[PDB]
Write a protein that binds this ligand. Structure first.
Ligand SMILES: Brc1cc2nn[nH]c2cc1Br
Ligand SMILES: Brc1cc2nn[nH]c2cc1Br
Length: 332
């Protein structure tokens, strides 16, 4: 059987809180009236999504309304409880209200207004400095939610709303976020293909906060190398092969042996043997301005097979890559 794992940081934070904090199934929701709002327009968030710009009639304030997709209410209360727990945290989207349509009875979340400019639309046109600035901003949100015992699990450019004129950033879509409890085995069918950590791909269930750090690595790699996605798999099996071709197969199989992972039979033929590639392989004339020794050292320390080996959010924030950002923050 597989070898147990525990989080390097924030391991027992939920244990030391009242049951009410994390026992989201016992949470009682006071449902508001969706009649306090009027939808203005549908926000283009993809096919699955049902997000709208709206106006709160009571005070003429712009808001964003997310109509919850028919789901186990377990998941609904989970997203609500996580949002409520993280409310007011650095770069976390603010849940304003919780409502139901009186006729349909369908649940909906009302958020603080933000522009519909997600990071995917801006993150391939950024300067060196701005990549570091916004990465550091994302890291604030990750450290906070992890410090509060929550892993996001869907960290990707599409879930990062950015107001580039006022330099503001919000981490959004907490619908896959879950509370970390040491020993718990989690669902591995979370996150999007290109940002799925190796632990998800080999079906290692006892993962932690460090999942989000892999996803952050994938985003960083994609930005500095101008390669979208960085790991471009056909499916979940070929995704790990794409990773394997960069990180190499030696650390992969070492990782499998360390945690005694029963590797799916399909993987046997498709992985092969590959060297660990030096990051220089991905630098070219059109991306050389975004790539530095500091960026490559930072990237390397996020993208590890072994989830234990990856930088924590706080450790990442104190990496040399962010020195000029930290400096400028204190100046202001
Ligand atoms: Br306002 C509002 C109007 C709606 N029509 N159908 N669903 C709705 C949800 C909200 Br909130
Ligand atoms: Br825009 C937006 C989209 C979201 N998806 N899930 N939560 C969200 C919050 C906002 Br604000």
């Amino acid at each position: 059987g597989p070898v147990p794992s525990r989080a390097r940081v924030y391991t027992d934070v939920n244990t030391h809180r009242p049951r009410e904090y994390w026992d989201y199934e016992s949470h009682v929701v006071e449902w508001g009236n969706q009649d306090d709002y009027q939808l203005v327009r549908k926000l283009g968030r993809g096919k699955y999504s049902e997000v709208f710009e709206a106006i709160n009639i009571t005070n003429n304030e712009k808001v964003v309304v997310k109509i919850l997709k028919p789901v186990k209410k377990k998941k609904i209360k989970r997203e609500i409880k996580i949002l409520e727990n993280l409310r007011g945290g650095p770069n976390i989207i603010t849940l304003a209200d919780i409502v139901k349509d009186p006729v349909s009875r369908t649940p909906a979340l009302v958020f603080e207004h933000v522009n519909n400019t997600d990071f995917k639309q801006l993150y391939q046109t950024l300067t060196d400095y701005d990549i570091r600035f916004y990465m550091y901003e994302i890291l604030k949100a990750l450290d906070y939610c992890h410090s509060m015992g929550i892993m996001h699990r869907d960290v990707k450019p599409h879930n990062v709303m950015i107001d580039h004129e006022h330099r503001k950033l919000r981490l959004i879509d907490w619908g896959l976020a879950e509370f970390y409890h040491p020993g718990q085995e989690y669902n591995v069918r979370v996150a999007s293909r290109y940002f799925k950590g190796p632990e998800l791909l080999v079906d290692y269930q006892m993962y932690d906060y460090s999942l989000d750090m892999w996803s952050l690595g994938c985003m960083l790699a994609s930005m500095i190398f101008r390669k979208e996605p960085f790991f471009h798999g056909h499916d979940n099996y070929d995704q790990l092969v794409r990773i394997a071709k960069v990180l190499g197969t030696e650390d992969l199989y070492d990782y499998i042996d360390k945690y005694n992972i029963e590797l799916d039979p399909r993987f046997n033929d498709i992985l092969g043997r590959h060297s660990r590639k030096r990051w220089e392989r991905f630098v070219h004339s059109e991306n050389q301005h975004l790539v530095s020794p500091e960026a490559l050292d930072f990237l390397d320390k996020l993208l590890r097979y072994d989830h234990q080996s990856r930088l924590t959010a706080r450790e990442a924030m104190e990496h040399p890559y962010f020195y000029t950002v930290v400096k400028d923050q204190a100046r202001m």
